[PDB]
Design a binder for this molecule. Structure first.
Ligand SMILES: CC(=O)N[C@H]1[C@H](O[C@@H]2[C@H](O[C@]3(C(=O)O)C[C@H](O)[C@@H](NC(C)=O)[C@H]([C@H](O)[C@H](O)CO)O3)[C@@H](O)[C@H](O[C@H]3[C@H](O)[C@@H](O)[C@@H](O)O[C@@H]3CO)O[C@@H]2CO)O[C@H](CO)[C@H](O)[C@@H]1O[C@@H]1O[C@H](CO)[C@H](O)[C@H](O)[C@H]1O[C@@H]1O[C@@H](C)[C@@H](O)[C@@H](O)[C@@H]1O
Ligand SMILES: CC(=O)N[C@H]1[C@H](O[C@@H]2[C@H](O[C@]3(C(=O)O)C[C@H](O)[C@@H](NC(C)=O)[C@H]([C@H](O)[C@H](O)CO)O3)[C@@H](O)[C@H](O[C@H]3[C@H](O)[C@@H](O)[C@H](O)O[C@@H]3CO)O[C@@H]2CO)O[C@H](CO)[C@H](O)[C@@H]1O[C@@H]1O[C@H](CO)[C@H](O)[C@H](O)[C@H]1O[C@@H]1O[C@@H](C)[C@@H](O)[C@@H](O)[C@@H]1O
Ligand SMILES: CC(=O)N[C@H]1[C@H](O[C@@H]2[C@H](O[C@]3(C(=O)O)C[C@H](O)[C@@H](NC(C)=O)[C@H]([C@H](O)[C@H](O)CO)O3)[C@@H](O)[C@H](O[C@H]3[C@H](O)[C@@H](O)[C@H](O)O[C@@H]3CO)O[C@@H]2CO)O[C@H](CO)[C@H](O)[C@@H]1O[C@@H]1O[C@H](CO)[C@H](O)[C@H](O)[C@H]1O[C@@H]1O[C@@H](C)[C@@H](O)[C@@H](O)[C@@H]1O
Ligand SMILES: CC(=O)N[C@H]1[C@H](O[C@@H]2[C@H](O[C@]3(C(=O)O)C[C@H](O)[C@@H](NC(C)=O)[C@H]([C@H](O)[C@H](O)CO)O3)[C@@H](O)[C@H](O[C@H]3[C@H](O)[C@@H](O)[C@H](O)O[C@@H]3CO)O[C@@H]2CO)O[C@H](CO)[C@H](O)[C@@H]1O[C@@H]1O[C@H](CO)[C@H](O)[C@H](O)[C@H]1O[C@@H]1O[C@@H](C)[C@@H](O)[C@@H](O)[C@@H]1O
Ligand SMILES: CC(=O)N[C@H]1[C@H](O[C@@H]2[C@H](O[C@]3(C(=O)O)C[C@H](O)[C@@H](NC(C)=O)[C@H]([C@H](O)[C@H](O)CO)O3)[C@@H](O)[C@H](O[C@H]3[C@H](O)[C@@H](O)[C@H](O)O[C@@H]3CO)O[C@@H]2CO)O[C@H](CO)[C@H](O)[C@@H]1O[C@@H]1O[C@H](CO)[C@H](O)[C@H](O)[C@H]1O[C@@H]1O[C@@H](C)[C@@H](O)[C@@H](O)[C@@H]1O
Ligand SMILES: [Ca+2]
Ligand SMILES: [Ca+2]
Ligand SMILES: [Ca+2]
Ligand SMILES: [Ca+2]
Ligand SMILES: [Ca+2]
Lengths: 103, 103, 103, 103, 103
C-alpha cells in the first residue's frame, strides 16, 4: 500500500506526477451523453480530465470516479491549493488518477 | 475527447454556447411529479433548465443530471461566477448540457 | 416546460405560491419510522413539510424528495433568502412542491 | 402529521425531548464493523448516538439514518445551534430520532 | 454500545488511539484501480489511510467507508481540529476505524 501520492503513481504504467502547488483556475462539468466528465485547468495552462466511465474502469472505480468529481468541485469553490496530481499521460487531457491537497 | 466546453459543445447538434461571466441570480428546484427539474436565471433575464430525466437520456446521463443540479445549487450559494453554458437550443427554456466556472 | 416557479405551480391542482422573501428560521429533520420527513418554519410563523415518501409519489419523485431536504438544510445553514415556495395547501403542514431562491 | 419536533416526539413510545440551545461540542464517527455509528456530545456532558442500522429499523429509515449523520457532521462544522433533540431514552447513549436547529 | 471513541477502540483487536489535537495537514485520494483509498497526514508526520474496500470488510461497512472519506475531506477543507483517531496498527499506513473532532 503506498504512503503518498508519488508512491501510488509509481504502481501504474503510463502515469506521472504534476506538482501544481496552486488552486484550480477553472472547473467544467458535462451531462451530455458519451461526455459525462469533468475538466479542470490551472493558471500555468495545464488541463486535466476525470474520464467518462468506460470499459477501462473496474467496478471498484465507479464510486471513486464520482468522488473525484465531487472533490474537484469543492476544491475549486473553496480555492483549495492542489499540491500534486497523479495522471495517466496516455489520454488528452491527461486523466486524473489521484489528487493531494496541502497548504 | 474535448479539452474545453466550447469544443465539447461542437460535438453535438442543436447546441450553442452562452457566455454569461456572471453569478446565478435565481435557483429554482421542483419535486413535483413530471417536473423533477431545476431552473436558473441570470440578472440579464436569461433562463435555463436542467431537463426532467426522460427517454432522450441514456443510462450514463442519469447520475450526471443529478450532479449538474448539485453543481448549480452550490454555484448559486457560493455566488460562483459562471463563464459559459453549453445548451440544447431546441428546448424552452434552453437545456443545460455543460457548465464552465472561472473567476 | 415552465420558466419560473409560479408557472410551474399552475401546472398542478391544489397548489399555492407563498412569497416569503426571508431566510429559513428553523430546520427540523426526523429518521423516526413513518415520519422520515423535514419541517421548516419562517419567522412569521409559516410552517412547511417535505412529505414522507408514499403512494402519492411516482418513482421519479423519490430522488427529488431527497434533493429537496438537502436543499432546505444547506439553505438554512447559509441563511439563504427563500423567494417563493410552491406548496400543496390541502396537506398540514403545507407540503413543499418547489422552492425558488433569489437575493 | 406533526408541525414541530415536540409533537413528533409525542407520536412515539419511549422518547424524550432534550432542549440544548447550543452547538455540538464533539462529533465522532466510526466505520468499524458492527459499530457503524456516530456519537455527538454537548459541553454540558450530554452524549447522543445515531444507532447502528439494524432490525429495529424499517426500510424507509435507511436513507434517513444516513441523512441524520450528514446533518450532525455539517451542524458540527458550521457551529450551528441545536435547539432540541428527540431521542429514544432507553438506549445508551440516548438514540437520536429527530433534530431541530434554530438561532 | 460505546459512549466515546476510546471505549469504541477497545472493542477491537489490533487497534490503538492516536491523540492528534491538530488539523489535517494533507488530504490525498485516489481513483486508480485497486487503490481506491484516501491518505491523510498531520504536520508532525503521522500518516493514516482509509483502506481500499475489500474482503476484510462486511457489507455494513461499505457506506461507512465512503462516509469516512467524505468526513476527512470536509474536515481538511474546514481546518477542523481532529482530537483522536482510532486506527488498526496491522496495516501501513495505519488504517482509520474512527475519528473524533472537538475544539
Ligand atoms: C441530435 C439528436 O437527435 N440527438 C439525439 C441522439 O441522436 C443520435 C445522433 O445525434 C448525436 C446528437 O447530436 O445528439 C450526434 C453527436 O455527434 C453525438 N455526440 C457524441 C459526442 O457522442 C450525440 C450522442 O451520441 C448522444 O447525444 C448521446 O445520447 O448524438 C443523431 O445524429 C442520430 O440521428 C440518426 C437518426 O436518429 C436516424 O433516424 C437517421 O436519420 O440517422 C441519423 C444519423 O445517425 O441519432 C443518434 C441516436 O442513436 O440520440 C440521443 C440518445 O442517444 C438522444 O435521442 C438525442 O436527443 C437529444 O437529447 C438531448 C439530451 O440528451 C436533448 O434532450 C435534445 O433536445 C435531444 O434532441 C432532440 O430529441 C431527441 C430525442 C431526438 O428527437 C432529436 O432529433 C432531437 O433533436
Ligand atoms: C497499462 C494498462 O493498460 N492498464 C490497464 C490494465 O492493465 C492491467 C495491467 O496494468 C496495470 C496498470 O499499470 O494499470 C499494472 C499495475 O501494476 C496495476 N496497479 C495496481 C496497483 O494494481 C494496474 C491495476 O491493477 C489496474 O489498472 C486495475 O484495473 O494494472 C497490465 O500490466 C496488463 O497488461 C497485459 C496486457 O493486457 C496483455 O495484452 C499483454 O500481453 O501483457 C500485459 C502484461 O500482463 O493488463 C492488466 C489487465 O487488467 O487493465 C485495466 C482493466 O483491468 C485498464 O484497462 C487499464 O487501462 C488504463 O485504465 C486507466 C484507468 O484506470 C486509464 O484510463 C488508462 O488510460 C488505461 O490505459 C489505456 O487504455 C486501456 C484500455 C489499454 O488499452 C491500455 O493499454 C492503455 O494504455
Ligand atoms: C389532483 C390529483 O389527483 N393529484 C394526483 C395525481 O393526479 C393526476 C392528475 O393530477 C395532476 C395534479 O394536479 O397533481 C394533474 C396535472 O396536470 C399533472 N401535472 C403535470 C405537470 O403533469 C400532475 C402530475 O401528472 C402528477 O401529479 C405526477 O404524478 O397530476 C389528476 O388531475 C388526474 O385526475 C383524473 C382522475 O383521476 C380521473 O378519474 C378523471 O376521470 O380524470 C382526471 C384527469 O384525467 O389523475 C392523475 C393521476 O391518476 O396523481 C399523482 C400520481 O401520478 C398523485 O396521486 C397526485 O396526488 C397528489 O400528490 C402530491 C405529491 O405529488 C401531493 O401528495 C398531493 O397532496 C396529492 O393530492 C392529494 O392526495 C392524492 C393522493 C389524491 O387524493 C388527491 O386528489 C389529493 O389532492
Ligand atoms: C415502542 C416499540 O416497540 N417500538 C418498535 C415498533 O413498534 C411498533 C409500535 O411502536 C411505535 C413506536 O413508538 O415506536 C408506536 C407509534 O405510534 C408509531 N408511530 C408512528 C408515527 O407510526 C411507531 C412507528 O410506527 C414505528 O416506530 C415505525 O417502525 O411505532 C408499538 O406500539 C406496537 O405495539 C403493539 C404491540 O407490539 C402489541 O404487542 C400490542 O398488543 O399492541 C401494540 C399496539 O399497536 O408495535 C409496533 C410494531 O409492531 O416497531 C418498530 C419496527 O416496526 C421498532 O421495532 C420499534 O422499536 C424502536 O425502534 C427505534 C428505531 O426506529 C429505536 O431503536 C427504539 O429503541 C426501539 O425500541 C426498542 O426496541 C423495540 C424492539 C421494543 O422492544 C421497544 O420496547 C424498545 O424500546
Ligand atoms: C481481529 C480480526 O481478525 N479481525 C477480523 C474479524 O475477525 C472477527 C473477530 O475480530 C473482532 C475484531 O477485533 O475485529 C473481535 C471484536 O470483538 C469484534 N467487535 C465487535 C464490536 O463486534 C470485531 C467485529 O465483529 C468485526 O471486526 C466486524 O467485522 O471482530 C476475531 O476475533 C474472530 O477470530 C476468530 C478466528 O477467526 C477463529 O478462527 C477462531 O476460532 O476464533 C477467533 C476468536 O473468535 O473472527 C471474527 C470473524 O469471524 O473479522 C472481520 C470480518 O468480519 C475482518 O476480517 C477483521 O479483520 C480486520 O478488519 C479491519 C477492517 O474492518 C482491518 O482491515 C484490520 O486490519 C483487519 O484485521 C486483519 O485482517 C483480517 C482479514 C484477518 O487476517 C485478521 O487476522 C487481521 O488481523
Ligand atoms: Ca480568491
Ligand atoms: Ca454578494
Ligand atoms: Ca445571520
Ligand atoms: Ca467559534
Ligand atoms: Ca488557516
Amino acid at each position: 500500500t503506498p504512503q503518498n501520492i508519488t508512491d501510488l503513481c509509481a504502481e501504474y504504467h503510463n502515469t506521472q506526477i504534476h506538482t501544481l502547488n496552486d488552486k484550480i483556475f477553472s472547473y467544467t462539468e458535462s451531462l451530455a451523453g458519451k461526455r459525462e466528465m469533468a475538466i479542470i485547468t490551472f493558471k500555468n495552462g495545464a488541463t486535466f480530465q476525470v474520464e467518462v466511465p468506460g470499459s477501462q474502469h473496474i467496478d471498484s472505480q465507479k464510486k471513486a470516479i464520482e468522488r473525484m468529481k465531487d472533490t474537484l468541485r469543492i476544491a475549486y469553490l473553496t480555492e483549495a491549493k492542489v499540491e500534486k496530481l497523479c495522471v495517466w499521460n496516455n489520454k488528452t487531457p491527461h486523466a486524473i488518477a489521484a489528487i493531494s491537497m496541502a497548504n
